Design a binder for this molecule. Structure first.
Ligand SMILES: Nc1ncnc2c1ncn2[C@@H]1O[C@H](COP(=O)(O)OP(=O)(O)O)[C@@H](O)[C@H]1O
Ligand SMILES: Nc1ncnc2c1ncn2[C@@H]1O[C@H](COP(=O)(O)OP(=O)(O)O)[C@@H](O)[C@H]1O
Ligand SMILES: Nc1ncnc2c1ncn2[C@@H]1O[C@H](COP(=O)(O)OP(=O)(O)O)[C@@H](O)[C@H]1O
Ligand SMILES: Nc1ncnc2c1ncn2[C@@H]1O[C@H](COP(=O)(O)OP(=O)(O)O)[C@@H](O)[C@H]1O
Ligand SMILES: Nc1ncnc2c1ncn2[C@@H]1O[C@H](COP(=O)(O)OP(=O)(O)O)[C@@H](O)[C@H]1O
Ligand SMILES: Nc1ncnc2c1ncn2[C@@H]1O[C@H](COP(=O)(O)OP(=O)(O)O)[C@@H](O)[C@H]1O
Lengths: 232, 240, 236, 233, 236, 242
């Protein structure tokens, strides 16, 4: 089977959607849409009755809710329903309001994984987003490989299908070799104008579009154009 | 979302209304691209609108900053006496004033002092010139430094600009995590095209709003910066 | 003698196939089809009476079996008849040890045990074909050791009459590794005019002449298909 | 805002009047781009204008510097004995007779600064050259920023306008101005060009202008531009 | 000046007679560019001309080198038994841990390496020597490359030998300056096609072709074409 | 300023008279570009104009070096005897502590102190007016931070004794620059010897990037290496495409 991202054009680009248990790496530079994209993935997940967990390391949950809320995505209700979770692995990297979930020390991936399996259990999560995974090893690159594979085993085991968001200043040291899929979002200046484009570089378990497709970010999120191709 | 008007000709148009309230905007660019003049113009316009502002100086002493702003027609003195503007001296300490940061070993005193200045004048706009100096010899501390300041500023209702210094040639914005941690990124460029340096601005990122995706030329004048939303740079200036 | 990969087009491109006992480095970036190519190589071998061994360092043998099954390649039958074997050199890398697997390398910090289990596996099934996916994981965090490791494994495998494929992960071909192996086959995925095109090229192959051209190929439901009579210069 | 005339042919026009008083200007370029001749002509024209100048030597011994200048027709001797010109020796302490101003330890700029303050005070200097400031931190780049900022404050606070020579093979953000001298090979020929990247306090030509080094120093052509690899206009 | 004929078709002509005797020639190139074959051809042809030769192996065990040379019709067995050819084993020591007349037990430094080499040159009155590859002697200690190349050079030239130092380059200090000559072998992809070329970058003691010449590797070794040149494709 | 004539065909013209006295000229380029040959032709011509030269050898033994210059029709034997020419052995110490015969020998290259000691002594016994250090790169290649002081220290020495010199600088093939931060700003002159593949052919060319004290050709001139030495063509220009 597959997992329908719900993101206009994407499921057609993946020929049906993301294969189950697959951990997809969404990489790209700043402002390419990785945040809106992965949030949309989870949001659409909810509308289809699929449990979702957002592991934030870049922003605090109260902030994430506000960002999504501005696109017309109110997770608060589902949060009360027990169909959506927000894991705070953010306040730990900046200092010290509680939450159902929180990682106090990311020195090790141990507590990180402990708290993760909890949120998955409580809502029987199906969809998961780690934004971002880069923060777990940016200053400890040799440990990236083990970290990516370990989180992978855990998620796939619980039947979850994942987007790891990778921040790029390549796709990210075994990281791009460890994941099942790779979707790169690009923002390129062409003839004096910035053009957004998406391309599925890798996707274990399926055939997929081999073309670079433009896309726009709108008030209601991302919209990819499967019938169009952008030439850089 | 509510917008903060920069007042800089062309910029609020380019931002489809202005900077979304509480956004931290990274103003990135090489030397002599107009980043300092731009950030000060942003603060001055705020004052004219009744929005108290703070300029955290890490590149020059506040005394010189006041002098330089005055030459553009921006005398902050009348405002400092009204408790509507403030200069934080985070410069002196770098090379051995109501607001002073004595030690930049840790970001702790920097924050305490910034918080002090914020409540003192009911600040709405803040400028840090420049953020790079806070970790340029501490690259690994950049991420947490940017994320901690951002939290303090948005948490106190401020809308800010973080000036980011990049060395000429590099199209970077500031490095790992920093360009990822800010809410917006406005790049000011100075490119040599056919034996001529041309200035241009481009909004690479701005959370909470759509914005022009084109590279617009601009000039630095006696009255500050002026961006031209109706012109684009495609290896040469052209209308629309 | 030639070891036939059985992968459509490959053997013609190798003018017969891989010279026996050769260690071939299969290099490429992520998603270029290296795992599938090497597994297809083992599969075809089983189909022609040649025992094979897949040494996993990137995935657990269980998932590998699954993955190969989706392509129509069920090894389970051969595994019980002593014709195929998976070597778990993965778990040690993550941490878990909560399962039973015949061949398993507990510690990857030394190539000593790795070679022990490999020798035992080759002994047990009389291995003729061996795949290591990926050798890169064995020295990524020890590049100065890569040279010895490649030549060491090279001596073992070749000594036991095995012909092997070492999968190399590229983010060149890998310092001194590209020199240690007998052959080099590069799998590429390049964006040309807004579209990703898959291609293969034989850079090196001690023991034989071979196509000096870049050939397009496709990954399908039944695996890889390479086109010997087609060439991808650049664009078409 | 007052202007300091470099007196170098074409340069003041390009700077739209001259260097804004008290500005520290970084003169950056690779070897043999003309940075030393330029900075020395700057001081010379200054002297021949009643403006006392100091040349801080970190690359050659003052004795040799005096020799290089005289060869172009700039004899500082008369001006030096008259207390209108001064040479600072911060060269010897870097590798191994008599010189009025000498910096014994370059470990850190404190002594460097003191000797510099003395020379300025002593001749009431108006122009100062540091050839080259790169040498003060070539092995300690993390110190470059503070050093540049410290010297800038000392010089500006004393009313001097300076040129820091930067040898290329937060510094550029710290100085007030930046003039790049280039030497590029185009069609089998080496062409010299100058370009003002930045100059706080004023507007200036935004073009790359060609120049020649002659027996009498540098001549820049403000009415010419170097575009592809050709001199146009 | 006295010349040493390589015997490789086209080479001696490109060298205007051949290698100036007593010269050390660095044969540099990436993987699969034909450096081993070229070097071995040089020695084989040397034997056929009554010029004893030595091959210092650091990449493969002398056993395998013998069998690979035979693969091209170069059976050194007849000459060795007659004290005309020698195989130095400076390989096994490289991967830790068989009798070989000439073996180097410690590569930690090159004193022993020089001893063994000195012994072999004397025993056979060697006139041609090949070291494959000299890169392995300092790959992990770049700073020592210069002195090692200069030391080996003084010893070889001191014994009247003419040599070829094979240098392994991946993809792209003292070394190239320390040798007498430099012959680069390349393998480049142009328009979906891999093309082999040789160019004499330096050869002390003589003039030589200043052009890049294409060449082929066959079942009988290398063949260089002095009448062809690579502007970018093969032209006249 | 009196010019030291190189004698090398076409060079003194390109330099508009020759090399300004006391100038330390860095001659750099990749392997096989003709730097050693160029430096020797310089000392040789220095002899014929009745000018005493020294050749500091760090890449070859003085015996081999002599055996190399002779191969070009340059026999310095008669001059070493009249004391009009000297050769320094700074090669052996680089690859061992072995003994041998040579009037001038530098035993330790850890520091440049002895080097100068021996050099000043060598300049004295004869009438050292021309000097060649080949290659200066060897002095600091493993300790790049020392390059600057080493270069300037040797400069002062030679200039202080009225010597005009060439420092041979070895750069790797493909490397653009001349020896890095230190070397290139500290020398008075820089002459680049290039060997570039243009249209399937290697072409030799020279270009003067810097020469304090004089004007000079600003163009790239082709040249040939012959059995008699180097021949640079001042009236020809090579166009590399860069
Ligand atoms: N309403 C909107 N209309 C069009 N574009 C928008 C709108 N809101 C936000 N954006 C775009 O979304 C971008 C940010 O996307 P995001 O996923 O947060 O970036 P990143 O890849 O750094 O995580 C902004 O830079 C902006 O260009
Ligand atoms: N009065 C003026 N008229 C025109 N241009 C000016 C004027 N004043 C300053 N400038 C320009 O402004 C530039 C400096 O802008 P600034 O923001 O200080 O640079 P940076 O981005 O490094 O902080 C100068 O290089 C100069 O070219
Ligand atoms: N059923 C299929 N049909 C066509 N292509 C497929 C199919 N299944 C997988 N693929 C392709 O195989 C690719 C993965 O190949 P793989 O060998 O795992 O990559 P890697 O080089 O990283 O080891 C996927 O990215 C996908 O494009
Ligand atoms: N009399 C002269 N006529 C023409 N050019 C000269 C004359 N004297 C020196 N030059 C040029 O000056 C250059 C050196 O300039 P200089 O300022 O010393 O270089 P740098 O940028 O390294 O400090 C020489 O390389 C030479 O080309
Ligand atoms: N019989 C043959 N006919 C044609 N080419 C061959 C033959 N045998 C080997 N080759 C070629 O020789 C190459 C290996 O040459 P070799 O000298 O071993 O490479 P290296 O430069 O890495 O030492 C192989 O990659 C192959 O393409
Ligand atoms: N008799 C000759 N005729 C033509 N060219 C020669 C002759 N002798 C040597 N050469 C050339 O001289 C080159 C070496 O010059 P050299 O100065 O030794 O190089 P480097 O710059 O590395 O010191 C050789 O590569 C060769 O091409």
């Amino acid at each position: 089977r597959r997992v329908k991202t719900g993101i206009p054009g994407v499921d057609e680009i993946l020929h049906g959607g993301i294969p189950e248990r697959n951990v997809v790496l969404l990489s790209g530079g700043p402002g390419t849409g990785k945040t809106i994209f992965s949030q949309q993935f989870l949001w659409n997940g909810l509308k289809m009755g699929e449990p979702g967990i957002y592991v934030a390391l870049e922003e605090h949950p109260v902030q994430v809710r506000q960002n999504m809320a501005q696109f017309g995505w109110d997770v608060k209700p589902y949060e009360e329903k027990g169909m959506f979770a927000m894991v705070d692995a953010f306040t730990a990297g900046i200092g010290k309001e509680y939450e159902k979930y929180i990682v106090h020390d990311l020195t090790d991936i141990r507590e990180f994984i402990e708290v993760l399996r909890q949120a998955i259990r409580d809502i029987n999560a199906k969809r998961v987003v780690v934004d971002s995974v880069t923060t777990l090893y940016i200053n400890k690159p040799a440990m990236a490989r083990s970290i990516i594979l370990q989180l992978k085993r855990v998620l796939a085991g619980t039947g979850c299908t994942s987007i790891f968001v990778s921040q790029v200043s390549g796709f990210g040291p075994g990281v791009e070799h460890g994941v099942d899929g790779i979707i790169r979002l690009d923002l390129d200046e062409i003839d004096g104008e910035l053009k957004r484009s998406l391309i599925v570089w890798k996707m274990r378990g399926t055939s997929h579009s081999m073309r670079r497709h433009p896309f726009d970010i709108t008030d209601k999120g991302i919209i990819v154009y499967p019938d169009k191709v952008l030439k850089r």
